[PDB]
Amino acid sequence: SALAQQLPGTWKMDVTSEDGVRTTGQMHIQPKTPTTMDVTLTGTHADGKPFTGQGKITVKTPTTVDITVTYEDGSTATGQLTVDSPTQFKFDMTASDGTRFTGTVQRQ
């Protein structure tokens, strides 16, 4: 599919919580199966402390994929990536405590 060909690579995260907290990072998507992919999220939170997360990306529609990430401290978040352009997906994830981040991932 198109998602399986486009998603692999390195992307810049640029998201904002519902309370206005902006955080960036790197999303590294690696192929695994024709419909599932490995993903690694790295960067620093708004307090400057680093974060590291690894998870799975699963295709949901020809234009959307599910994404689930477990961070190093055991925190878990699930969300969706939606294709927006040849170089951009919409990013929308929610942590277990209800904190929601919306934004983009752009190809790097």
Helical/strand content category: mainly beta
Widest sheet: strand order? 1-2-3-4-5-6-7-8
Run of helices and strands: HEEEEEEEE
Number of strands: 8
The proportion of strand residues reads over 45%
Distance between the termini: 21 Å
Number of domains: 1
Task: Give the helix tally.
Answer: 1
Q: What overall form do the CA principal axes indicate?
A: globular
* Major β-sheet annotation: 8 strands, antiparallel, barrel
Radius of gyration: 13 Å
> Helix proportion of residues, in percent?
under 10%
Protein model, in words:
With 108 residues, the chain is mainly beta. It has one domain (1-108). 5% of the residues lie in helices and 67% in strands. The protein is built from one helix and eight strands; from the N terminus they run αββββββββ. The chain has one helix at residues 2-6, and strands at residues 9-17, 22-31, 36-44, 50-59, 64-71, 76-85, 88-95, 100-107. Strands 1-2-3-4-5-6-7-8 form an eight-stranded antiparallel β-barrel. A hairpin with a 5-residue loop joins strand 3 and strand 4 (50-59). The longest helix has 5 residues, at 2-6. The protein is globular and about 40 Å long. The chain starts with a helix and ends with a strand.
